[PDB]
Amino acid sequence: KTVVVTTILESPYVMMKKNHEMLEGNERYEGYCVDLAAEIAKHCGFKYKLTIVGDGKYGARDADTKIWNGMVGELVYGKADIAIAPLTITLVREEVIDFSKPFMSLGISIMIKKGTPIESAEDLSKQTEIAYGTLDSGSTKEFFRRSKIAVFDKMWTYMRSAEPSVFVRTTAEGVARVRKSKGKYAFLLESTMNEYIEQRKPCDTMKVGGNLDSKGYGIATPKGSSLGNAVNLAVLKLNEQGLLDKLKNKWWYDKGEC
Ligand X SMILES: Cc1onc(C(=O)O)c1C[C@H](N)C(=O)O
Quick one: what does residue 190 bind among Zn ion, its own copies, ligand X, none, with the CB cut-off 5 to 8 Å set by partner type?
ligand X
Q: Smallest distance, Å, CB 114 to Zn ion? A: 30
Are β-strands 15-16 and 29-30 bridged in parallel, bridged antiparallel, or unpaired? antiparallel
Check: CB of residue 101 under 8 Å from CB of residue 236.
yes
* Per rule CB under 8 A, count of chain residues that contact its own copies: 29
Per-residue mark of binding to its own copies, 114-153 (x: CB under 8 A): -----------------------------x--xxxx----
Nearer to its own copies by Cβ, of 100 and 137: the residue is: 100
> What string of H, E and C letters represents the secondary structure of the chain?
CCEEEEECCCCCCCEECCCHHHCCHHHHEECHHHHHHHHHHHHHCCCEEEEECCCCCCCCECCCCCCECHHHHHHHCCCCCEECCCCECCHHHHCCEEECCCCEEECEEEEEECCCCCCCHHHHHCCCCCEEECECCCHHHHHHHHCCCHHHHHHHHHHHCCCCCCCECCHHHHHHHHHHCCCCEEEEEEHHHHHHHCCCCCCCEEEECCCCCCEEECCEEECCCCHHHHHHHHHHHHHHCCHHHHHHHHHHHHCCCC
Q: Smallest distance, Å, CB 145 to ligand X? A: 12
Interface with ligand X, residue 58, by CB under 6 A: yes
The footprint of Zn ion on residues 2-21 (CB under 5 A) is 16
Quick one: what does residue 88 bind among ligand X, Zn ion, its own copies, none, with the CB cut-off 5 to 8 Å set by partner type?
ligand X
Residue 93 is assigned to a ligand binding site: yes
Part in contact with its own copies (CB under 8 A); list of ranges 5-13, 15-23, 37-45, 99-107: 99-107
Interface with ligand X, residue 135, by CB under 6 A: yes
Residue 88 is assigned to a ligand binding site: yes
Nearer to ligand X by Cβ, of 23 and 92: the residue is: 92
Part in contact with ligand X (CB under 6 A); list of ranges 15-23, 120-128, 188-196, 200-208: 188-196
Binding site for its own copies (CB under 8 A): 89-91, 94-95, 99, 101-102, 105, 143, 146-149, 213-216, 218, 232-233, 236-237, 239-242, 244-245
